[PDB]
Amino acid sequence: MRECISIHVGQAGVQIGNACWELYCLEHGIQPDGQMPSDKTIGGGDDSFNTFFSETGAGKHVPRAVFVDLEPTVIDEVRTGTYRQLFHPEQLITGKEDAANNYARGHYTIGKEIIDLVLDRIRKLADQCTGLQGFLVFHSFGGGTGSGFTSLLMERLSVDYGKKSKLEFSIYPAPQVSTAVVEPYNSILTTHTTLEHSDCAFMVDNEAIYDICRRNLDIERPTYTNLNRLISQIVSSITASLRFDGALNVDLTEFQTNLVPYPRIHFPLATYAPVISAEKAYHEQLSVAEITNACFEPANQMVKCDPRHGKYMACCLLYRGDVVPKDVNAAIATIKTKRSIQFVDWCPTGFKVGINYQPPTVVPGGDLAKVQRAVCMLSNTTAIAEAWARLDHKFDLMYAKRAFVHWYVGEGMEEGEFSEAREDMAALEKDYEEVGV
Amino acid sequence: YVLIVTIGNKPVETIGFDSIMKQQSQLSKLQEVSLRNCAVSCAGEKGGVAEACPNIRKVDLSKNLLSSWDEVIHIADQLRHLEVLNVSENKLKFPSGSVLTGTLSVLKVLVLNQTGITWAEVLRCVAGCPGLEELYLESNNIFISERPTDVLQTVKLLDLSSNQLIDENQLYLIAHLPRLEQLILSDTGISSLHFPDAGIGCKTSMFPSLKYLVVNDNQISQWSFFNELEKLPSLRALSCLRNPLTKEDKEAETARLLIIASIGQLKTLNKCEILPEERRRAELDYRKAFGNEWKQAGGHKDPEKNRLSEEFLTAHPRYQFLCLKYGAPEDWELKTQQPLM
Amino acid sequence: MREIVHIQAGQCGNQIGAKFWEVISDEHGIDPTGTYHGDSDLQLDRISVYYNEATGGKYVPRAILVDLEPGTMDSVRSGPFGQIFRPDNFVFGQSGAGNNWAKGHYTEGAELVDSVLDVVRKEAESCDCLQGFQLTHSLGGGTGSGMGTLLISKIREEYPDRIMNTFSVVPSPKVSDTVVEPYNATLSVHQLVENTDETYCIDNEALYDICFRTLKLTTPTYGDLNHLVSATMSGVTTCLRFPGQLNADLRKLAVNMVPFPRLHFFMPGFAPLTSRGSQQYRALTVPELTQQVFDAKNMMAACDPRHGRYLTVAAVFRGRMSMKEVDEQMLNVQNKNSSYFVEWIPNNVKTAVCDIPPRGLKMAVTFIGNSTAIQELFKRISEQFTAMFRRKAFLHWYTGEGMDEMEFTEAESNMNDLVSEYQQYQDATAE
């Protein structure tokens, strides 16, 4: 068997990690203190859920995670939270000074003092595992500790462990959730830096999830807890293949072979259904063909784009719960007789489907409801290029004036980094246009 | 359970289907079944389900040919571990005055939407599940007649939505519930709620354990609703999005601050946490808006010359506590309604 | 816990620092004895930013007094709040500089820089997380501005990863009768344009005009200028001394207010304007406060923001008001179709809210603008530089110490380039 390690950097990163671990403990039945009454092989062994939890002498299931932050404020809530007995004190790494939303600081000044400790902690955590698969890093692009330090750690992990995958779960910022005007400046830098040290990357448009929470979940002003719960649900639906011995996507190296036909192109599109509110617990029922037809909707995707124009390179469907193969075939025939779709004929990948016979789960007392079946579609598409056309555009709006750029140069990096980064963006856009034909 | 498409330009390769079909072929290992549109008209021979799959935890016999209610109780009896039971969109014929108990003790959730059951019928139907923790009775045109006696005392969920015959007189009958922790009332036509048993500044004895009151898409046009909501003893959560009083317009926040100002223990509104900053903003707006009227109603900072009328108190029963929390409004704070020439 | 080490050089700088400390002591709630008798939890919520934690709960300031003569160092030691300061925080010499930049920057300044850096390091070592450095001084004197520039350069060389703030004061003929005040003003500006991140321009001509006309004072003295400066300083650091929903970080604030590394000069203002003794007049509403704070009359600099372009603006209110009111006011001001439209406020102001107004007032507002109109001030002294450098007047005082006419030409060229860049960016499209 093989396990995995998840490094959570930044505020959004540690929040998403905490939500994911809470959902995992609620699904597997692990109590906050770390007591699994369903587990019988104490001490250690090999199980489906052993790929993300280490067993101790007292039967404690310690999550295989590393929460690092450049500020003690955020980690204080985790240390004093209800799950204080779940995570180990050493796994939580804190810093005395933050990046102040700066990439140069997180990649040079503050990063050079904490990168060594992070690497030592990762090595200590990996010593217990007999076979590691990759490193599921969680960050975003609107901060300086999520881009700078993430790229700095990727640069070292590509040298220490080169034979291990490196999956990411980035968060695409939005102009309504933006906390700084140099938020793009950080994004471009870390994007250009992790291109050769990342196999598959998952981006979350903040505006898309905000609109989903406002419409589906029916919330007046969705907060960061409402968006951290949905990201945890997505992460659980995606990792069920590794946490329940799923047939499709059994390991991390398969994500690059199924959803990444091209090395440079590694930004699939992930959509999930359904999204019922807690109030409408038993109002309507959705079949296996009514939830698979809701994952081909622009408003249901995690990134605002128009896949109907471009063409798809890959496609992987994952059902979770009561789903019969006949229903899956009927839904496929419906999707193949109703919607018009284009596909790359010279791509070395195609359509794949997998099922996981496990009941869904939702945080009790939350805004989500318990459904009987769920679907998650991961499809790489050229329409994601649109998501870039916006980002790069803002960069130009900040390049003609060179505003707030001296702050980044007066910390470590030089000036050619921006030209290299925008030159890497132009090449990516050209490759996207070529693949789209 | 026991029993090629070519999209775009690539085939559809299925993997792992054999594992699922071999896992579902096991009837003694079924933890949840959702028989929808399966055309279930009868239960069949007795004992067959008690030995084939007697360990089912969830059943959803919605949209079937179930005629009589006994056909459902027969299936529920053989299942000694029935934790969830949903039979919506079925025209069941329940008894007239018979109670079937000793068959749903392990039932924690019950759903009977669009079933056509009335109040007198459901009162006896729920007798078999005295330890029921959740109950859903929406979209049924139910008309409450009298309050339950020894039935539904462990139910913490009362979903009474899509019922246009649920007035406050009918809600008073279900307010006696001792463990009712939630009450849904969306799309019911309610327009006002009163509690004459209590006065201004007191706590009503009704709804002792109510913690979440959902009244979204209702006839809430008067501020008296939120003012009376203050009397609830444990109203921690509230929900109200589309009312004659609540708008989706950008200028609706002005009303939100008032809602939080009408309830004291409202820590969450419309599925959003409330902070001290939010509480203070909403409390400063309520005083800034209702200061002028407090002067005309006979108000004065003098602790012995404060003589307010009854209408101003009934309309603002949460304005006297704020007068002491942040002092009374000054004369220079009530002169911002004139332009310049 | 972000700690900021305060510094004050020169007579004017020391006086301004002492006044600001005495003003904020009454707001935080720390009696001059060195203990806290405040009754607000919000006061001690961020007291560590400017006060140290000693035994018995005694709060000690983080200020570092520096001079070349002892007179002013003795006056502050015996002032109303002269006991809170540590005795070993007073660094001074005997001869002074003599209104000469070369004598206060290269000789005596560099001679006492060792003893000053000693205390600077002793203070910096007693901090959990050092954020930056602040300095209060003037630009029309030798010791003050010379030692200020020298210490700024030293702190930049020894701590390149720290922010620098300088509340420099620009002299004026109506306040001083010294002829070599333009030369020292030009050299300090050249040094600051190279080794500074923030520079709050506090003109000594605008303050005099305000004290003469607004306050209706017959013969205003330094006591009517220092009080206003301390009030403006307290209004500027309102977020850095008390909580607030808005980001109260110094680095992020400087990054947002320093889009240009040469145009980092900020004009500060504050309404309502009060004098000494009489301060409790009335409570102005939010509209009136916003109209008065953005008025050229309540500007500490002689330049009018209207005669230029708004690059960055930061507003901070304090009293008993909600952020919703300020937001609505600021959004209606820019609405061209509203009944409250003006023509001197940009379409983006970093608004803040506070619940601790100053003493003698129920509401107050402070504004900081990176407008290009400040260039006018840079042209006011430049003209004087042409009426002296061309005649080589008093040049033997500088060349005799070590300075070269090559240093003067470089400073003049730097000032001219700064003025040209300001005037060029003033004509940019408002997209």
Ligand SMILES: Nc1nc2c(ncn2[C@@H]2O[C@H](COP(=O)(O)OP(=O)(O)OP(=O)(O)O)[C@@H](O)[C@H]2O)c(=O)[nH]1
């Ligand atoms: N989805 C989501 N986005 C978040 C969350 N927290 C912050 N963000 C976004 O992330 C960006 C801010 O980055 P942060 O993670 O807060 O900052 P940081 O990366 O830790 O870096 P420094 O501030 O430089 O220390 C903005 O785009 C925010 O909207 C969160 O919980 N969920």
Ligand SMILES: Nc1nc2c(ncn2[C@@H]2O[C@H](COP(=O)(O)OP(=O)(O)OP(=O)(O)O)[C@@H](O)[C@H]2O)c(=O)[nH]1
């Ligand atoms: N506003 C204000 N300006 C002052 C004050 N004291 C001095 N100035 C101005 O400061 C300028 C230079 O004087 P100082 O700063 O006292 O001198 P110094 O900096 O100690 O330098 P040396 O005299 O060479 O030792 C002159 O233009 C004065 O007008 C004061 O208390 N307030």
Ligand SMILES: [Mg+2]
């Ligand atoms: Mg952070």
Ligand SMILES: [Mg+2]
């Ligand atoms: Mg002097």
